[PDB]
Nucleic acid binder design. Structure first.
Ligand SMILES: Nc1ncnc2c1ncn2[C@@H]1O[C@H](COP(=O)(O)OP(=O)(O)NP(=O)(O)O)[C@@H](O)[C@H]1O
Ligand SMILES: [Mg+2]
Length: 377
RNA sequence: UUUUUUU
């Protein structure tokens, strides 16, 4: 039931088409904060439902306002994500649950024509990646001065170096120092350390809310994910991975293998231990192929995806029951987000980290920092 | 390193 929340009958019917019949904890704990207009920073584990944590109350709020739908109208909501496929996926959690609001998704490697047409038609909710959106602001086509709501998903990556400046210049169009006409700021991640909270305060009002479902003294990773580790020299790694997938991935199960470089990921996808069922996904793949590859992985045209961290965050593929990491990452955030491509929305999954003898120090650091212990198989 | 306008 939805009886504690102001969700219309029409949104309940659309949410049923997505398999949503009640709010998950992170959604229940944030709904009135978002709906009523307060700023919010929220931390919850991978796979617990952060996307609808902002999308449903924002849609209910916007449905309850005037909405005259004039042609060429400026966006009321901005959502930023760190990758093109994540933006596309987040886009659909708005679009699937409104018939009224015009939802647009702008990112790179896409033709401009369709994006200009949506701008001419009018946008209510804009989801996208920073680069292409910055581009449309600077060519004069996009108006973000009328934003009422700004979501940074994966906020800790959006505000790290590599995005901080791009994000800053985009938000500088809508945010001014010391102001009460600034849009509502909504910030979400499975990993929200002190530094992110500190940088976040610059964009938030004094009246902001915090919701932390992870807390201290709790494992950082999704609770339904089992963590295993395999010691293996890099010369053996491809073959053992091939055998691991055959026995640790289940009936109609999908596997993601994460590697540290585009070069490693591409070459592993070619290795005959896995190439027959595998495709690569990384930033040197042209965007049309990235989307075809991801869609095939989602619908089960092949069962093994070899990816860089382009696929580490946000992507939700329910059939992924096996994550393999080719080596322990030096950033524990990377291990946490990668491991969380499995074990989502209460399903169990397995994450297996390969490591060389000289990478054992990094394995131990991931263990300690994430609050987990690897079974060494 | 890896994302992320254009190339
Ligand atoms: N209330 C709900 N009822 C049923 N399914 C839900 C509900 N909320 C979310 N889901 C589904 O659960 C999955 C996880 O949601 P998602 O919003 O991707 O999690 P997340 O917290 O953003 N994970 P991440 O980005 O990896 O840190 C998706 O398949 C959702 O559609
Ligand atoms: Mg997410």
């Amino acid at each position: 039931s939805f009886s504690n929340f102001p969700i219309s009958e029409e949104t309940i019917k659309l949410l049923k088409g997505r398999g949503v019949t009640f709010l998950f904890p992170i959604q229940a704990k944030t709904f009135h904060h978002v709906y009523s207009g307060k700023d919010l920073i929220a931390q919850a584990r991978t796979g617990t439902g952060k996307t609808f944590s902002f999308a449903i109350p924002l849609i209910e709020k916007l449905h309850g306002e005037l909405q005259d739908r004039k042609r060429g109208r400026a966006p009321q909501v901005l959502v930023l994500a760190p990758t093109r496929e994540l933006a596309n996926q987040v886009s659909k959690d708005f679009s699937d649950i409104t018939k009224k609001l015009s939802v647009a998704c702008f990112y790179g490697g896409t033709p401009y024509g369709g994006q200009f047409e949506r701008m001419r038609n009018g946008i209510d909710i804009l989801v996208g990646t920073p680069g292409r959106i910055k581009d449309h602001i600077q060519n004069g086509k996009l108006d973000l001065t009328k934003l009422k709501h700004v979501v940074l998903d994966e906020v800790d990556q959006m505000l790290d170096m590599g995005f901080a400046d791009q994000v800053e210049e985009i938000l500088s169009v809508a945010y001014k120092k010391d102001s009460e006409d600034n849009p509502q700021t909504l910030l979400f991640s499975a990993t929200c350390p002190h530094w992110v909270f500190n940088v976040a305060k610059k964009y938030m009002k004094s009246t902001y809310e915090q919701v932390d479902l992870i807390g201290k003294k709790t494992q950082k990773t999704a609770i339904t994910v089992e963590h295993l580790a395999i010691k293996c020299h890099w010369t053996q790694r491809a073959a053992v991975i091939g055998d691991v997938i055959r026995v640790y991935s289940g009936h109609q199960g999908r596997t993601i293998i994460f590697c540290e470089t585009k070069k490693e990921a591409q070459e592993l996808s070619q290795n005959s231990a896995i190439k027959q069922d595998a495709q690569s996904l990384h930033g040197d793949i042209p965007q049309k192929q990235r989307e075809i590859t991801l869609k095939g992985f989602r619908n089960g045209s092949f069962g093994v995806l070899v990816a860089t961290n382009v696929a580490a965050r946000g992507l939700d593929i329910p059939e992924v029951d096996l994550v393999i990491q080719s080596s322990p990452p030096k950033d524990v955030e990377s291990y946490i987000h990668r491991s969380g491509r499995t074990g989502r929305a209460g399903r169990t999954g397995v994450c297996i980290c390969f490591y060389q003898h000289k990478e054992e120090y990094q394995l131990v650091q991931v263990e300690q920092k994430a609050g987990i212990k690897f079974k060494r198989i």
